[PDB]
Automatic annotation (TrEMBL), chain A:
Subunit structure and binding partners: Part of the 30S ribosomal subunit. Contacts proteins S5 and S12.
InterPro entries reported in the protein's UniProt record: Ribosomal_uS8, Ribosomal_uS8_CS, Ribosomal_uS8_sf
Any single biological process term in GO: translation
Keyword rRNA-binding: yes
Family assignment from sequence similarity: Belongs to the universal ribosomal protein uS8 family.
Gene name per UniProt: rpsH
Name of the protein in question: Small ribosomal subunit protein uS8
Species for this entry: Staphylococcus schweitzeri
NCBIfam families tied to this protein: PRK00136.1
Recorded GO CC terms: cytoplasm; ribonucleoprotein complex; ribosome
Gene3D superfamilies: 3.30.1370.30, 3.30.1490.10
Keyword annotations of the record: Ribonucleoprotein, Ribosomal protein, RNA-binding, rRNA-binding
Tagged with keyword Ribonucleoprotein: yes
From TrEMBL, chain B:
Pfam hit, one: Ribosom_S12_S23
Protein encoded by which gene: rpsL
Family: Belongs to the universal ribosomal protein uS12 family.
Keyword RNA-binding in record: yes
Record-given protein name: Small ribosomal subunit protein uS12
Any one annotated GO CC term: small ribosomal subunit
Segments for region (Disordered): 1-54, 117-136
Quaternary structure and interacting proteins, as annotated: Part of the 30S ribosomal subunit. Contacts proteins S8 and S17. May interact with IF1 in the 30S initiation complex.
Function: With S4 and S5 plays an important role in translational accuracy. Interacts with and stabilizes bases of the 16S rRNA that are involved in tRNA selection in the A site and with the mRNA backbone. Located at the interface of the 30S and 50S subunits, it traverses the body of the 30S subunit contacting proteins on the other side and probably holding the rRNA structure together. The combined cluster of proteins S8, S12 and S17 appears to hold together the shoulder and platform of the 30S subunit.
GO BP terms in the entry: translation
Amino acid sequence: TMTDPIADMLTRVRNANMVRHEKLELPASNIKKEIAEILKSEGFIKNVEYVEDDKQGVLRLFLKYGQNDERVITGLKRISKPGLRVYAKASEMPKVLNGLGIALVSTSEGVITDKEARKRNVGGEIIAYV
Amino acid sequence: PTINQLVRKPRQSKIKKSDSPALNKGFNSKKKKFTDLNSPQARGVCTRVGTMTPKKPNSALRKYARVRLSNNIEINAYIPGIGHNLQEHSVVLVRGGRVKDLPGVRYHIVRGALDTSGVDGRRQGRSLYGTKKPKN
RNA sequence: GUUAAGGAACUCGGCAAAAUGACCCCGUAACUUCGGGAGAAGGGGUGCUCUUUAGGGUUAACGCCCAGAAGAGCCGCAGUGAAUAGGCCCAAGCGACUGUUUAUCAAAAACACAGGUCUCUGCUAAACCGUAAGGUGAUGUAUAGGGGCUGACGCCUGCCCA
RNA sequence: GCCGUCGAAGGUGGGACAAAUGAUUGGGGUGAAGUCGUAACAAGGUAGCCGUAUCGGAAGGUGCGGCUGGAUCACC
RNA sequence: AUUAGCUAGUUGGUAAGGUAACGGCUUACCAAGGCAACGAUGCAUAGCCGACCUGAGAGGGUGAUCGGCCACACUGGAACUGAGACACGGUCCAGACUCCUACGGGAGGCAGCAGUAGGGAAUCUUCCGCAAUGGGCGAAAGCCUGACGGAGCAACGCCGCGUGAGUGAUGAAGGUCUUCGGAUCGUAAAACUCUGUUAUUAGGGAAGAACAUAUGUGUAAGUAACUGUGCACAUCUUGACGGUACCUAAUCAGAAAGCCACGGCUAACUACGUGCCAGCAGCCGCGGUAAUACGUAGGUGGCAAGCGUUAUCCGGAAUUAUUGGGCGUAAAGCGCGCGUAGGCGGUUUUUUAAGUCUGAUGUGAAAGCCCACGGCUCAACCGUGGAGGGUCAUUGGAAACUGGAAAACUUGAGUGCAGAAGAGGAAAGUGGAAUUCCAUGUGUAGCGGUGAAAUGCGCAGAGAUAUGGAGGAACACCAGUGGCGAAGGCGACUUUCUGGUCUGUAACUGACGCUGAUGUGCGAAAGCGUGGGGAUCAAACAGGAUUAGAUACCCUGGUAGUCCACGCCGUAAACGAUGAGUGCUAAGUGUUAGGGGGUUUCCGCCCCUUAGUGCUGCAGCUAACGCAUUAAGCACUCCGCCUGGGGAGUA
RNA sequence: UGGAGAGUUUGAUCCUGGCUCAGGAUGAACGCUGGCGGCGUGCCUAAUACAUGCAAGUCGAGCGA
Ligand SMILES: [Mg+2]
Ligand SMILES: [Mg+2]
Ligand SMILES: [Mg+2]
Ligand SMILES: [Mg+2]
Ligand SMILES: [Mg+2]
Ligand SMILES: [Mg+2]
Ligand SMILES: [Mg+2]
């Protein structure tokens, strides 16, 4: 059946960018309400709402493009999927494209970016890349 | 494949085999050193003066020496160079490497330190054949 | 009846004799129709006296018969001390088996056999005994009766109808 | 000095696993094709192929099922 | 794992004995367990770590000198003394070997330091010696020290270093190439000029040696610096190597340089001899009358006191791929269901800290690689510092996800109710049309078969032709892209019994899931076993010709088999050549069974929503073909398999 | 801190795919040549019988004689 839907959200990030859609209506929860509101403060999405009912409330996504109708999000890569777990080192997590992107870690403090982990040296699960 | 399966059976890699079979292993002990390992070199003892041909399209003639090695087993050979001061049952040093387009011959008889000692007729390619010149 | 050293050298041939033999234990191969092989083979122990303890039935119970364990000890060359009681193993040949045969020179590899087929018989059946009457087959009726060949089981049974 | 428990080596016997070897024997690759036929690839001149039987010197041939990886006009 | 069971004092209590102690540690009655698909047991190969090798790293291969630990002493047991040996150089015994005795007996154990013998393609002096550091003994001088301080020998490995340079045009002699009308090496050589690291001449001559001993006068017991010390010095003393390391002064640039290659790769070309020959070869191969790819001289290139060849190992090889692959046709998706362990599991809040995170301590000893420096004249090596181990134990904080624990949630999955469509099975009847064989007539010389013909049945009345009755088997027309079952598959009709799927949803407890290594159950036909029944078609089989030859192909004949009941065997181009499960992303055009908006116009119509079913076609992916909402697209989970072609799905 | 490639199936291609070479190593052997100052490492194959040498003693302020 549907195992780990966190990848299925990040699948539909890639689906709408590829055929250049605008509106994305997926169900999401408080795990994923913590997810997409990272990149809105990083420059990938126009606006992220809040989930309506916190269980069955769909989180609508309106994607951000360029002025030339040029694509902002290049691609996405899961890292720690069910069957192989990846956890970050102290200061030794790797960089996305020599630092030009967001690597999403959910440390012992909550979902942060890989930039915010180098002020407190934490590890946590390296969930996805950009 | 799947990381579950890779735990249950690892990557048992590809075995290879020696290109030259009849040397370099612990063989068949029989309360003495009945047969042994020769990693680069050995002695020999000869059995036959050899004359043969290549077989593919080629039509030349070749001069091997079918021997019995110092570990009970049977191999062919070849004498590089010109001279042949060899007869049946004379000691010959060995060194490996097959000869292409001959159907079954195995190694090279070392022209330096054996009864195959020194080959005259060569003056420039020298240490591949064991020829001296003490002027230079 | 016994015999020194040797043990089939005897001889058509281990022919006759000699060894093995009971009960209680450990252990047992190839091969197969899964039952068998198997008592396979090769091995050990046994006598008398004395001390303790656990075992049925009979009986109110002393009493009586049935038994098995360890331990300690004694004696002889030898302890089922006399008589009675399998020698075993490897590989082939023919017949599957138990059976039966030449009373009185032949006990088998011959005869039977369970099974396979082939043919004949619609009932007052065919077949056989009897010149006939009468009977057997049968108070049975094609899953049953008489005859010819082969001889469990396994895999099979090839061409010729002048 | 003698008696007893435990105890290497030795002797006896039936097994178990590899290895060396053996009269003949059955396929296999290698060559160089001399010997006998053309079974595939064109509709290869009987369309091929996969299972499964039975026969023949030699590829192979026929039977019953499935497949197109079956030309013509793709078999209307 | 082409090895699945395994130990029996084995597993346990109890008892007393037993060694430094626990102890089936060895024995005795009872007791029914140990281990195991998470690899128990049994075979062949092996000393193991710190480190060495290669690599971008992750990893692969190795176990030598050098340190820590371990075992063993020609072979197999057993002891004794002492603080803590089953004792290498001791010891009693037993075995196979050497050799002597008076043949009664005894002796011998160089895997100590070397040297000889021996299988070998292969590894060295039978060297003086205790001065330094370390060890036994003694209160000290000292004593034995094959530990060791060092030398004798091999390019064995790395390092450093020379065989010289400054000056020195007329292409001097002269080689093979050439119109040899000529070039090349080549200021090279021939000379001229300095130098002497190195050495063909001997010698002064190490810091490495601090001490000990006492004696020079100090530490307390100084009573007593005699004693343990030598806490003034340790000063009448301690160097085989060593007339060494070093270094000056001399006739002399004079003794001191190779080796492999030179088509393409791959760094480096020319002229003849031989001319598919003597050869050569890492592959393409260059060789049938020279041939830039064979020997030769010239020429060049490489490295350099060293150059090539071999056998072996790692990289090249993303060619076992966790970092870093693949399955439609190229190697690779089980023939397909139910399914145990196992793997993975939606959402919510609250704890727990088991993973994960970071803090703290202790430890994973020297020595190597690296990060640095006085010095050996640099350097190889030494010296000091530095980084380098945890998948660990334990010692606090954090609660984000994965996980045990408390509570409710309803999209997934299941039932209830309302409804249809079916060749989905399994027993029992029943019906029609064609094939074959028997009964009679009318009837009669042909029926067949074919590229052509026959073999054969017929004239004894065959086929043709009619009624007749005997059997057995398939199931025309509907029938089509349709339907159904997980697959193999299932098409005449009626009846009793019997599974699953779907449409619409008010109901219902409330994650009850997906995948499945072994296990287990169905499997097209052919084939086999024991019984029935046997029309047609028909392997095997006999026949005629086609064929030089013919089971072949073609023709009339023909048995096992085909059908049923029962028990087996389980394979196929068992195919969509595409494993299952969930979500996802441009659209047009059919068709079948159902539901949504109409007076429901009836197979009129358009308007929609859901599930199977076919076609055409963007982005994307693909070697290309071609898929392309029923993906071969983007992702997640779990299972199966592949690693050149034969040998071979064989032994 | 730092990570290369070339050749070969066809008349000619793209792909899958093997095999082969260049490089680093050796307590290596063996082939030719030979100046060394200086530093290291030299039974890895029959566990094939081991001459001749030296490797465990010390204590004469134990105590005898
Ligand atoms: Mg017997
Ligand atoms: Mg027997
Ligand atoms: Mg009568
Ligand atoms: Mg099929
Ligand atoms: Mg010693
Ligand atoms: Mg020494
Ligand atoms: Mg059938």
